[PDB]
Design a protein around this ligand. Structure first.
Ligand SMILES: *[C@@H]1O[C@H](CO)[C@@H](O)[C@H](O)[C@H]1NC(C)=O
Ligand SMILES: *[C@@H]1O[C@H](CO)[C@@H](O)[C@H](O)[C@H]1NC(C)=O
Ligand SMILES: *[C@@H]1O[C@H](CO)[C@@H](O)[C@H](O)[C@H]1NC(C)=O
Ligand SMILES: *[C@@H]1O[C@H](CO)[C@@H](O)[C@H](O)[C@H]1NC(C)=O
Ligand SMILES: *[C@@H]1O[C@H](CO)[C@@H](O)[C@H](O)[C@H]1NC(C)=O
Ligand SMILES: *[C@@H]1O[C@H](CO)[C@@H](O)[C@H](O)[C@H]1NC(C)=O
Ligand SMILES: *[C@@H]1O[C@H](CO)[C@@H](O)[C@H](O)[C@H]1NC(C)=O
Ligand SMILES: OC[C@H]1O[C@](O)(CO)[C@@H](O)[C@@H]1O
Ligand SMILES: OC[C@H]1O[C@](O)(CO)[C@@H](O)[C@@H]1O
Lengths: 509, 509
């Protein structure tokens, strides 16, 4: 209660609850009449850790960066219980029978969630008559009960082609995504089971949505799947599958495993309902291994930025293209640019570092770099350049995290190691992570790559080659310290990298 | 040539070439008549890095721990070329036509390998008339040519049921394991293509073999597959698939992705031909990200220990079992025990550490622990115990690596970070790794786990719950330093962990 780390630790444009604990994002939807984005979330107001009475918290935004936190939206019947993860749909034609002519068609809000009770997990529904701020639970809940304690996280959507509601839900420890159908939101029929990819310990938060292919009129169905624990990166992770859907079964185009984000801290991804023009979604920006131990107070956890999802044919090797999930952050004009550094066609050497020199710092920065790898033979320890994110010097010390690229490995890397900062379960807080990527393009024989990164006080999101792979990681600088300046450096005496374009900005909410 | 790190850096019971560079193990087989295990390997005698003139190196052992290095077995025609990876079969019935009645059936040795030429990779064969020491290349090589630059690593075996030789080989950048059949070893027909799992950048070193199910006469076919780069852990990794095979098509039982070893340094796994009683194999114990940069001289790289492979139904979560690949190290009685510490039913507390007190060190140790997790509530940062592998004190400092278990996370971990040891591409040298595992057993309500680890001067191999998961990692202590003592410690004042059995031994060649 006495300790508030916000000044150096609290993101400016990632949603955080004012106080208490947050995990999975829930009930993501857009109110077309109010022009409002809704974020609900797994919420424990009573501690900075997971705990039951568990609630759906609630925040709204007009732009996906400025959030207004509201009163709790849904709560359990007993302190014994919790409103677990779930989604929202807008029942325009009152298929559910909950809504009058008094309720606007695009405000006919129905939440579908897991009700957690000792020894039981069921799918329940609730409706809102005030635009999603208060909910009335359905009298005949549960709408689905299969006598299981491992049965959770419904994502529901209206499937036009088969004229019905579809729910994807996990039968967690059976490693099945279960696809149900309903005309009602009330009466559900199990149509199929899907099992694939990286199993780990459990299936969680499934998703199923039609995603547009860039530069075309075509699309694919994409099944999303969260697993925790047992990620090959340790703890929790999201993966995806690309294929087709008929309203009854999902059929992947192949049997390959791919992760949505290859950072440590991107979990329980959900898409927004009622989005016209493409697919938008976000995740909980932490990892179950250490999420409840990180040195923030009086809150723990942020969401990721909202991201825009497309499919693109990209080279995964020099010979072969794969239809691949692309994501890029949603950053509206409402974000202010405090200051910026711009550079053009710079041949980087050890005597030519790029160094930001802004007046102060709000701890929110982005950098956008397009670079070419030149034909220069350099000693093996020097085939790289590095973006350094430095804090202010406090008590004679500067904390930094490093993002780099090695030309011999054709791989980006992060090193989020910060000495001296300790918290429980940091044995699982992996510091070094890498991402292999083929060139974005070729300028004659020269390999071209791009990188966009955004740093927001305790979270860095990296997007490689125009969103070809994304990597999300939190980081924890020592007390009082936060990002103040950015440097771009190399040890090569001659130029191995040309930065064709460098734009570094200090931003504000 | 002047610098030799062997005294502190060179493993004692993992094979290493006396000088030069080693990668993929090749041509693994047992000679039933000579009673000899054969190891061949990708070998460059001329540098401590990969390079053309590339050869098959050769070593033998009677016991899979004591290795005798021989003359080079196979070399390229030109400096421009290399004998790339491959396998060996014994042609008992002389289907190839290479072998007289003067060559013992168990000694009818044929190597099948990729010939690498500028702009071309083909599959070629060679025969040995002296028990596998010298080879003659087949007159009409190549035996398979698909006009490709990315077509390598043949693993071949006799398939009784369809009465033919089978080759698995990869069309690396096409993400296909190709299955060919032959009556001849000379004339091949393409039977099927297999594509699945984690794709990464490239498919490499496939294998396909019947693996015995424990307590059963039955087996499953397991398809092995190496990928590099693009491992989810960064760089290089091996994965597997469990299913059925009819001589033509491999059909997995499911479509899940699983890794053979979830350390950083276990790649290009191959199994030994001509094994009676089960399946034995080993891998190259490094990662392509940094393999040619680690601080050893005048050699680089070792193999893993030989491991014994079976299939077992194990709990991947509390409710569900999966038929899973299990592996345990091959350690004969020819290994000398210099000293040991043996304890029984001991409780770990901060005042009861386990400390090895041996007279000297050969730098080779194993530890074998079975432990129970007690019902004790402790603060979040203390829900663990650690095995410390400590060097001798040199420049008034001790180097240490750490292996532990956290009860709250049900996960083992390693931290191989060593201060003040630098080498190129260490940005990719991941220090922290973890492995989630359900209990081995329950003693009443108490969770039981097991751990076996072996440390051999610069490589640690970990086997959790009797080989349920394996994790292999190299480590590099400061100059002159190597493992000298082992500690088992905890910060809990009351016992959280009961060590039912602890055996720590100092071992020697
Ligand atoms: C789906 O899985 C459940 C197991 O929880 C089973 O009851 C049901 O029969 C399966 N249905 C189909 C169509 O495969
Ligand atoms: C997302 O991208 C799509 C293209 O699929 C575009 O139509 C839409 O305007 C974008 N939306 C946002 C919020 O960036
Ligand atoms: C990065 O810069 C390019 C122009 O080179 C621009 O098209 C792109 O929108 C920028 N990305 C972001 C996320 O601001
Ligand atoms: C490479 O090593 C081999 C040893 O087998 C030797 O014959 C040859 O001289 C060396 N070649 C080069 C180009 O260094
Ligand atoms: C296997 O793959 C190759 C591509 O290299 C293709 O030409 C061939 O038709 C495929 N064979 C089968 C049976 O799918
Ligand atoms: C490997 O294990 C099996 C038991 O499944 C045994 O038959 C065989 O002798 C073992 N091989 C070695 C080399 O220990
Ligand atoms: C470890 O110890 C157990 C029981 O003490 C024994 O059965 C097993 O063989 C040992 N494992 C290894 C790999 O030495
Ligand atoms: O808080 C309980 C909720 O948390 C999650 O387990 C994943 O983090 C969900 O699957 C569940 O709804
Ligand atoms: O040295 C070339 C050899 O190395 C490998 O690429 C994998 O490390 C093989 O696929 C190939 O045979």
């Amino acid at each position: 209660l006495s300790v508030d780390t916000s000044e150096y630790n609290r993101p400016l444009i990632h949603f955080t609850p004012e106080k208490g604990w947050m995990n999975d994002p829930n009930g993501l939807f857009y109110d077309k009449t109010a022009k409002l984005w809704h974020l609900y979330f797994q919420y424990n107001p009573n501690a900075t850790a997971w705990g039951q009475p568990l609630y759906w918290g609630h925040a709204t935004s007009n732009d996906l960066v400025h959030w207004d936190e509201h009163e709790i939206a849904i709560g359990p019947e007993h302190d014994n219980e919790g409103i677990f993860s779930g989604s929202i749909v807008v029942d325009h034609n009152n298929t559910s029978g909950f809504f009058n002519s008094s309720i606007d068609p695009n405000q006919r809000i129905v939440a579908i969630y897991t009700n957690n009770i000792p020894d039981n997990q069921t799918q329940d529904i609730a409706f809102s008559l005030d635009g999603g701020y208060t909910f009335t639970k359905y009298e005949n809940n549960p709408v689905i009960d299969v006598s299981s304690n491992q049965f959770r996280d419904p994502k529901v959507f209206w499937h036009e082609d088969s004229n019905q509601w579809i729910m994807v839900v996990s039968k967690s420890q059976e490693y099945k995504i279960q696809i149900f159908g309903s005309a009602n939101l009330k009466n559900w029929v199990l149509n199929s089971n899907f099992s694939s990819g990286y199993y780990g310990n459990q299936y969680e938060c499934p998703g199923l949505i039609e995603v547009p292919i860039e530069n075309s009129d075509k699309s694919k169905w994409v099944m999303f799947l969260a697993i925790n624990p047992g990620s090959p990166l340790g703890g929790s992770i999201n993966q995806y599958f690309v294929g087709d859907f008929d309203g009854f079964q999902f059929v992947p185009d192949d049997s390959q495993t791919r992760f949505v984000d290859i950072g440590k801290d991107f979990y329980a991804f959900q898409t927004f309902s009622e989005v016209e023009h493409g697919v938008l979604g976000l995740a909980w920006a932490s990892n179950w291994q250490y999420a409840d131990q990180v040195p923030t107070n009086p809150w723990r956890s942020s969401t990721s930025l909202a991201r825009n999802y497309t499919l693109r044919y990209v080279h995964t090797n020099a010979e072969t293209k794969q239809l691949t999930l692309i994501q890029n952050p949603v950053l509206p004009d409402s974000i202010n640019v405090v200051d910026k550094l711009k550079k053009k066609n710079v041949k980087l050497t050890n005597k030519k570092p790029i160094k930001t020199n802004f007046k102060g710092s709000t701890g929110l920065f982005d950098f956008n770099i397009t670079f070419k790898v030149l034909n220069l033979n350099v000693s093996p320890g020097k085939t790289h350049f590095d973006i350094l994110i430095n804090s202010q010097e406090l008590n004679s010390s500067v904390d930094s995290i490093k993002i780099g690229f090695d030309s011999s490995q054709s791989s980006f890397y992060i090193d989020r190691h910060i000495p001296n900062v300790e918290f429980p379960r940091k044995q699982f807080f992996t510091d070094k992570l890498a991402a292999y990527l083929e060139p974005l393009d070729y300028d004659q024989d020269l390999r071209v790559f791009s990188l966009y990164g955004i740093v927001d006080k305790n979270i860095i999101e990296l997007y490689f080659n125009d969103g070809t792979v994304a990597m999300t990681n939190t980081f924890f600088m020592g007390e009082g310290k936060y990002p103040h300046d950015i440097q771009i450096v190399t040890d090569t005496e001659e130029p191995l990298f040309e930065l064709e374009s460098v734009i570094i900005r200090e931003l504000n909410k």
